[PDB]
Amino acid sequence: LPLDPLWEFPRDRLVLGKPLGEGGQVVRAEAFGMDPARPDQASTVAVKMLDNASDLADLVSEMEVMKLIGRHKNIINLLGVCTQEGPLYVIVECAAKGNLREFLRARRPPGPLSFPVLVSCAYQVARGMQYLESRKCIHRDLAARNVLVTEDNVMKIADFGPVKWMAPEALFDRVYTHQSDVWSFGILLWEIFTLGGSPYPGIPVEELFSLLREGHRMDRPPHCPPELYGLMRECWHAAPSQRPTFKQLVEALDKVLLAVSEE
Numbered sequence: 001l002p003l004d005p006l007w008e009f010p011r012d013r014l015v016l017g018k019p020l021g022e023g024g025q026v027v028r029a030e031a032f033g034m035d036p037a038r039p040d041q042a043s044t045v046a047v048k049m050l051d052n053a054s055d056l057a058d059l060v061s062e063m064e065v066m067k068l069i070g071r072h073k074n075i076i077n078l079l080g081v082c083t084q085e086g087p088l089y090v091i092v093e094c095a096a097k098g099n100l101r102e103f104l105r106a107r108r109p110p111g112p113l114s115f116p117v118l119v120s121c122a123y124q125v126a127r128g129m130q131y132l133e134s135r136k137c138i139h140r141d142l143a144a145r146n147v148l149v150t151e152d153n154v155m156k157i158a159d160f161g162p163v164k165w166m167a168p169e170a171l172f173d174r175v176y177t178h179q180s181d182v183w184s185f186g187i188l189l190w191e192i193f194t195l196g197g198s199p200y201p202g203i204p205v206e207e208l209f210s211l212l213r214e215g216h217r218m219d220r221p222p223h224c225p226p227e228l229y230g231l232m233r234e235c236w237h238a239a240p241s242q243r244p245t246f247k248q249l250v251e252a253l254d255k256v257l258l259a260v261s262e263e
């Protein structure tokens with residue numbers, strides 16, 4: 001593994017802690033001097049690392065993809081890498097509040113999350129996806145369990161390097177596109193405005209394809225506005241070309257965000 005002067009970070013300034021999540025490995029860590037302005041500062045970071053792998057090429061591939069995509073507010077960004085003098089470390093931003101799904105469920109009314117905040121969550125994810133799209137990257141598994149929440153309530157898309165979430169052309173035909181991502185985004189919308197609900201409640205997955213093929217979709221969530229449900233329904237069009245682009249989704253969600261923020 002070659003040295004990249006643009007990303008190589010010294011191991012001597014990286015202290016590891018308790019394992020985070022599960023499996024590959026993502027660990028809790030302490031980084032010193034991540035911000036070149038203050039080298040003596042300590043920040044909490046996430047380190048993606050490889051003890052029983054053959055998978056190094058997979059981690060390296062992800063690393064280089066992360067370098068290639070670039071940075072954005074709404075994605076899990078690369079901070080530094082440790083390729084020299086030891087095992088491979090991929091240091092990325094942290095999300096202290098876990099994924100969006102669990103984040104929403106914990107803040108459920110029998111309402112800690114105001115409605116403008118919900119629309120914000122959706123807007124942010126839509127922004128991150130638009131960026132990912134423009135950087136030529138299909139997910140294609142976009143879900144609430146893949147969107148992470150930082151301490152500043154910033155949405156950050158992860159794993160940009162499951163039947164309930166898949167578009168029809170992906171399920172049956174194995175065709176993955178930007179427009180298939182938009183379908184999934186429709187499901188994520190439904191996930192958000194149900195405050196972390198499980199899609200297609202009480203419906204066997206084998207019955208899902210029939211329902212979708214029969215033109216059926218999920219119902220409007222109890223206290224969801226028509227506009228936001230209308231966006232869900234547009235994402236869930238059978239024809240991919242009849243689905244919105246992320247640009248239109250960003251504008252549509254910004255339109256609601258700004259409006260709801262009034263009262």
Ligand SMILES: COCCNc1cc(NC(=O)N2CCCc3ccc(C(=O)C(F)(F)F)nc32)ncc1CN
Pocket residue numbers: 020021026027028029044045046047076092093094095096097098099148158159
């Ligand atoms: C690859 O996705 C599986 C794990 N995803 C991540 C998970 C996290 N962090 C995270 O979930 N939590 C959850 C709960 C409490 C917590 C407290 C601190 C931190 C971080 O400061 C640190 F651990 F350093 F990442 N992270 C978390 N950070 C970055 C990523 C990913 N790329």
